[PDB]
Design an enzyme around this catalytic site. Structure first.
Site, PDB file in Angstrom:
ATOM      1  N   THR A  10       6.479  32.412  25.147  1.00  0.00           N
ATOM      2  CA  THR A  10       7.566  32.675  24.928  1.00  0.00           C
ATOM      3  C   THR A  10       7.625  33.758  25.616  1.00  0.00           C
ATOM      4  O   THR A  10       6.800  34.325  26.566  1.00  0.00           O
ATOM      5  CB  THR A  10       7.285  33.199  22.666  1.00  0.00           C
ATOM      6  OG1 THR A  10       6.332  34.107  22.320  1.00  0.00           O
ATOM      7  CG2 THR A  10       7.684  32.092  22.216  1.00  0.00           C
ATOM      8  N   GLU A  11       9.393  33.704  26.252  1.00  0.00           N
ATOM      9  CA  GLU A  11      10.072  34.667  27.179  1.00  0.00           C
ATOM     10  C   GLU A  11       9.313  34.940  28.555  1.00  0.00           C
ATOM     11  O   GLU A  11       8.824  35.733  29.838  1.00  0.00           O
ATOM     12  CB  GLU A  11       9.673  36.021  26.812  1.00  0.00           C
ATOM     13  CG  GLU A  11      10.110  36.065  25.344  1.00  0.00           C
ATOM     14  CD  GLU A  11      11.737  35.372  25.468  1.00  0.00           C
ATOM     15  OE1 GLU A  11      12.624  36.049  26.105  1.00  0.00           O
ATOM     16  OE2 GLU A  11      12.332  34.679  24.704  1.00  0.00           O
TER      17      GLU A  11
ATOM     18  N   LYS B  61      12.300  30.667  31.302  1.00  0.00           N
ATOM     19  CA  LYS B  61      12.608  29.267  31.440  1.00  0.00           C
ATOM     20  C   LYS B  61      13.855  28.910  31.445  1.00  0.00           C
ATOM     21  O   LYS B  61      14.194  28.476  32.049  1.00  0.00           O
ATOM     22  CB  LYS B  61      11.975  28.399  29.905  1.00  0.00           C
ATOM     23  CG  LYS B  61      11.839  27.338  29.394  1.00  0.00           C
ATOM     24  CD  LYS B  61      11.096  26.855  28.037  1.00  0.00           C
ATOM     25  CE  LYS B  61      12.117  26.934  26.889  1.00  0.00           C
ATOM     26  NZ  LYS B  61      11.803  28.411  26.527  1.00  0.00           N
ATOM     27  N   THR B  62      14.665  29.303  30.475  1.00  0.00           N
ATOM     28  CA  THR B  62      16.310  29.402  30.587  1.00  0.00           C
ATOM     29  C   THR B  62      16.392  29.514  32.043  1.00  0.00           C
ATOM     30  O   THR B  62      17.809  28.889  32.475  1.00  0.00           O
ATOM     31  CB  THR B  62      16.951  29.895  29.307  1.00  0.00           C
ATOM     32  OG1 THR B  62      16.424  30.042  28.553  1.00  0.00           O
ATOM     33  CG2 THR B  62      17.971  29.602  29.329  1.00  0.00           C
TER      34      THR B  62
ATOM     35  N   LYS C 290      19.649  21.153  24.896  1.00  0.00           N
ATOM     36  CA  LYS C 290      18.452  22.394  24.512  1.00  0.00           C
ATOM     37  C   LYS C 290      19.227  22.116  23.082  1.00  0.00           C
ATOM     38  O   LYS C 290      19.562  22.532  21.791  1.00  0.00           O
ATOM     39  CB  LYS C 290      19.213  24.393  24.170  1.00  0.00           C
ATOM     40  CG  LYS C 290      18.610  25.178  24.058  1.00  0.00           C
ATOM     41  CD  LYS C 290      17.318  25.813  24.717  1.00  0.00           C
ATOM     42  CE  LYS C 290      17.065  26.462  24.439  1.00  0.00           C
ATOM     43  NZ  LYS C 290      15.244  27.003  24.900  1.00  0.00           N
TER      44      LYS C 290
ATOM     45  N   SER D 158      16.959  29.616  19.386  1.00  0.00           N
ATOM     46  CA  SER D 158      17.263  30.976  18.259  1.00  0.00           C
ATOM     47  C   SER D 158      18.227  32.122  18.638  1.00  0.00           C
ATOM     48  O   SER D 158      18.198  31.909  20.539  1.00  0.00           O
ATOM     49  CB  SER D 158      16.186  31.325  17.365  1.00  0.00           C
ATOM     50  OG  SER D 158      14.560  31.148  18.727  1.00  0.00           O
TER      51      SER D 158
ATOM     52  N   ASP E 233      20.513  30.655  24.833  1.00  0.00           N
ATOM     53  CA  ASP E 233      20.452  29.948  25.798  1.00  0.00           C
ATOM     54  C   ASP E 233      21.657  29.099  25.808  1.00  0.00           C
ATOM     55  O   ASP E 233      21.479  28.855  27.076  1.00  0.00           O
ATOM     56  CB  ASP E 233      19.042  29.618  25.773  1.00  0.00           C
ATOM     57  CG  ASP E 233      17.669  30.589  25.841  1.00  0.00           C
ATOM     58  OD1 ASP E 233      18.078  31.401  26.477  1.00  0.00           O
ATOM     59  OD2 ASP E 233      16.771  30.334  25.304  1.00  0.00           O
TER      60      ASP E 233
ATOM     61  N   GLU F  27      15.763  21.542  27.704  1.00  0.00           N
ATOM     62  CA  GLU F  27      14.829  22.565  27.776  1.00  0.00           C
ATOM     63  C   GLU F  27      14.062  22.832  25.795  1.00  0.00           C
ATOM     64  O   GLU F  27      15.451  22.712  25.519  1.00  0.00           O
ATOM     65  CB  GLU F  27      15.087  23.990  27.999  1.00  0.00           C
ATOM     66  CG  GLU F  27      15.074  24.829  27.972  1.00  0.00           C
ATOM     67  CD  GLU F  27      16.085  25.825  28.268  1.00  0.00           C
ATOM     68  OE1 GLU F  27      16.235  26.206  29.078  1.00  0.00           O
ATOM     69  OE2 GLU F  27      16.015  27.065  27.625  1.00  0.00           O
TER      70      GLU F  27
END
Ligand code: NA
Ligand code: NA
Ligand code: NA
Ligand code: NA
Ligand code: NA
Lengths: 217, 222
Positions: free
Chosen positions: A12-13, A16-17, A38, A42, A50, A112
Site C-alpha cells: 500500500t502506498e 501506483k497512481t 480505478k 478509497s 486517485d 488500477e
C-alpha cells in the site's frame, strides 16, 4: 487488438497512481486512445483522490462514472469499510464493469487496482480473484525501499502460481534517500528473471517516457 | 538433543518487531526453566551502545549473557539495508551452506528449543541467487511468522504464507504484532488474515504486557 494491463503495487502506498498518470501521459502524447479505470477507490479529495488524479491526467475527457464503480472514504480496506457500511465489493460486478470497456475504440485499457495482489475484496476474496477471472496481464509497481525485494519477488511468485502474465514491473524510485537503488533493482531482475520495464524517479526524465512507451508497443 | 524443537522466525516486512517477539519467546522459556537458545545468524543495524548489531545485543541481554555474540551470530553488518547488498560491497559471502552448518552445529547442545531469527522477510536475498527461503528449505524446520498489523499487512501476510505452502515449509504459527496502537481495525485485519489463510492467529502481542500473551506464546512451544 486492445492491450489490457491490471496495475498493482508491491505494498500500500507505492505511488501506483503516480505511475498510472505517467502511463496516461505517454498515451496522450503519442495520440494513443487509452482509458484508465480505478474500479475500487478509497479516500475522498466529492471524488476520491486517485479517481481525480486519473481524470486530471485525461484532461477531463472522461467522467468518474466511466472509470470508477465503488468508492470508500476511510484509508483502510475498501474491504473493511465495505463490511462496516454493509456493501459488497463483488468480483462479478467488477469483472462486468471492466469487460464492458472491451468494445470501446481504445488501443490500451489500464485498470488500477486497490493496493497489492492479495488485498482483500471481502473476508473470502482478494484482488487476485478478479485479475484471474479477467485473464489479463499485470503491471507491477514496486516502490524501491528496504524490504522491496522480498515484496516484489513474493508478488511475482503468486502471479506465476496462478498463471497471471506479468507484462512488466516498474521501479518507483520515489525516495532519493534510499541507498543502493540500482543494486536493489538489479537484484529483483536477477532473482525474478524479469528486466525492469522502467525506473521512475521524482526527477522528470525522457528515458522514463521512452521506457514507459516500450511497455505499450 | 534429539528432542530439540526448532523455529525459524521471519517477518512480513523488514521492520515488524521480530526481535521484540524473540525476546518475549526467550522470556517465556527462561521463566519456565526451558533450555533455549536464539540465533541471529545474519544481522544488520549497529547497536546504539556497541560495535555489535542491535538484535544481537537484544538476544544477549534476554539471556543475561549466558551465551556469547559468536554463539548467536555468524555475519553482521552496520548498515540497516538489504544484507546481501552490503555483503557484495564488503566482499562477504552470505553462504547457505555456512549458515546451515552454523545452525545445525547447535543440535548437539542440551537445548529444548532453538529459535533462529531471520534477516527480514521470506524472500529477502542472501545473494544475487539465494534468499532466506533457500536456508529455511535446507534446514527442514518450521517457521514462525511475525506480522506487524498495519494497512497492507493482509496482502503481505497472505503472500508470505502462500510462498511457504508452495515450498512445503511448515508454518508453526503466525503472530500479530500490534506494535502501533494507532492502527485502525486491528481485530478486523487479524480476522481477515485468519479467514483467508486458514490459520488462526497464535498470539496477539500489544505494547502493553498481558497474561494471554505469555499463555499464547507458551502454547506455540508446547
Ligand atoms: Na461495452
Ligand atoms: Na476465496
Ligand atoms: Na505460471
Ligand atoms: Na555442536
Ligand atoms: Na536460486
Amino acid at each position: 487488438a486492445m492491450k489490457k494491463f491490471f496495475i498493482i503495487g508491491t505494498d500500500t502506498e507505492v505511488g501506483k497512481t503516480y505511475i498510472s498518470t505517467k502511463l496516461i501521459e505517454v498515451c496522450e502524447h503519442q495520440n494513443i486512445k487509452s482509458l484508465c479505470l480505478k474500479p475500487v477507490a478509497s479516500g475522498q479529495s466529492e471524488l476520491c483522490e486517485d479517481v481525480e488524479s486519473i481524470l486530471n491526467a485525461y484532461k477531463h475527457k472522461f467522467t468518474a462514472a466511466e472509470i470508477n464503480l465503488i468508492s470508500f472514504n476511510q484509508a483502510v480496506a475498501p474491504h473493511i469499510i465495505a463490511a462496516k457500511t454493509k456493501v459488497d465489493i463483488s468480483i462479478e460486478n467488477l469483472k462486468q464493469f471492466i469487460e464492458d470497456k472491451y468494445n470501446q475504440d481504445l488501443d490500451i485499457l489500464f485498470i488500477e487496482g486497490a493496493g497489492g495482489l492479495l488485498t482483500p475484496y471481502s473476508d473470502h476474496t482478494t484482488q487476485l480473484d478478479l485479475i484471474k477471472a479477467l485473464q489479463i496481464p499485470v503491471l507491477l509497481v514496486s516502490a524501491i525501499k528496504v524490504g522491496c525485494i522480498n515484496h516484489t519477488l513474493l508478488t511475482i511468485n503468486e502471479l506465476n502460481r496462478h498463471n497471471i502474465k506479468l507484462a512488466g514491473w516498474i521501479a518507483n524510485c520515489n525516495d532519493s534517500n534510499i541507498k543502493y537503488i540500482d543494486e536493489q533493482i538489479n537484484t529483483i531482475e536477477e532473482l525474478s528473471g524479469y528486466k525492469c520495464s522502467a525506473k521512475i524517479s521524482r526527477n522528470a526524465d525522457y528515458l522514463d517516457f521512452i521506457d514507459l512507451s516500450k511497455i505499450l508497443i
